[PDB]
Amino acid sequence: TIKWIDWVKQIQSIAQAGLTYSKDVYDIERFQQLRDISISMMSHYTKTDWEVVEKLFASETGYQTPKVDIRAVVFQNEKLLFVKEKSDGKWALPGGWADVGYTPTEVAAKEVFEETGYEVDHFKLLAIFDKEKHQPSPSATHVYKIFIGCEIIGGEKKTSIETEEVEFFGENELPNLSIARNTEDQIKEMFAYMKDPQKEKLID
Amino acid sequence: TIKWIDWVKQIQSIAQAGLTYSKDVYDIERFQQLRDISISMMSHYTKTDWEVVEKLFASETGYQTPKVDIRAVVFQNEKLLFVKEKSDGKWALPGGWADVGYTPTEVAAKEVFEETGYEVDHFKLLAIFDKEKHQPSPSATHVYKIFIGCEIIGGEKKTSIETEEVEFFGENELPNLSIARNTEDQIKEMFAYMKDPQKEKLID
Ligand SMILES: [Gd+3]
Ligand SMILES: [Gd+3]
Numbered sequence A, B: 001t002i003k004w005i006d007w008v009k010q011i012q013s014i015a016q017a018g019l020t021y022s023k024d025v026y027d028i029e030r031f032q033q034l035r036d037i038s039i040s041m042m043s044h045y046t047k048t049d050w051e052v053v054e055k056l057f058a059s060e061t062g063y064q065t066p067k068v069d070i071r072a073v074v075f076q077n078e079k080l081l082f083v084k085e086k087s088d089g090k091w092a093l094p095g096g097w098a099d100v101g102y103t104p105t106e107v108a109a110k111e112v113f114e115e116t117g118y119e120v121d122h123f124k125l126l127a128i129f130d131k132e133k134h135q136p137s138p139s140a141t142h143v144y145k146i147f148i149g150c151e152i153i154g155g156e157k158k159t160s161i162e163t164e165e166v167e168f169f170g171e172n173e174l175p176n177l178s179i180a181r182n183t184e185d186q187i188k189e190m191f192a193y194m195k196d197p198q199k200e201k202l203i204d
């Protein structure tokens, strides 16, 4: 069983919350002890160095919420824009982690420019999917995925020698998907939005 | 040797002291959470250890994104559901930070219930606002604010311990708004979603 992952995540989150909001020196202290126990459990049951765990799992200030992933949904002539990335050799919509300081649409703009060379605007909110519901894997965190539609208003598509790396793909010729970044049904949903742009915008 | 046993004992031992001693309702709610979980972990078989999940942190870098706030938009008879927390005697839609382990709609449901006693369903994605763009509050915290409409289907009007008053207000009679949790303009746009259910979703 790996139910423990969720329990430990909950414990740390509540300890993190306590440390942010408690104003009582003795309870703040209790929360801190509680945070350290959670690091120790995590460190032991993943076989990961304590300080590494503290960094990656318990170094955040303020209340703990899921993290934000942005995916940009760009159509040219009925085909959807994908990028293949280093690790997988598998294809994903342009996007990534949402940066502090940047609005959801700004992250979408930056990631499209960076990953594809295209310049985008006229943004549409299309869906928010829960990562843990749609592409589950044992994970220390929890991820919300915002899909934002964009129109190409400029720039130009990246070029790549000997490797295909940025293409548009049609509904019946989808490439090998990076499931962690987008599931098949998530992609399908964007085509359903394509064929009927006024439909229910999905939220998990 | 099975190390999870004594870690869970400490968690309960500490959370037990926490809820015996603390006179802060928020801290109390946190320690009761921690007591529940430890109990839920205790009830498992005490001779079995947890599956080790190595490389749980192999993929992750500790990357930080903006936090997530969820606001529920609930209309009864053309009036919008507001909640008054004590601190400042000010009014906000049911909502709050999203928690690890919950989908966005699960958050909205959970906070409506806790704060008001109502059961909601029939979720509809309305808007994602960037917090820094609408209600700059001197803290450093970057927050994405998801507005999710939904409908009462059951429950009971129940005033909790964190909440002084639960009331619905029409567009021309808005209470003194907690600007931090919701601006007057965001409230206005929510009313425009009611008038026109095909209004374009706002996204910063
Ligand atoms: Gd990327
Ligand atoms: Gd509460």
Ligand SMILES: [Gd+3]
Pocket: B094, B095, B096, B097, B111, B115
């Ligand atoms: Gd609240």
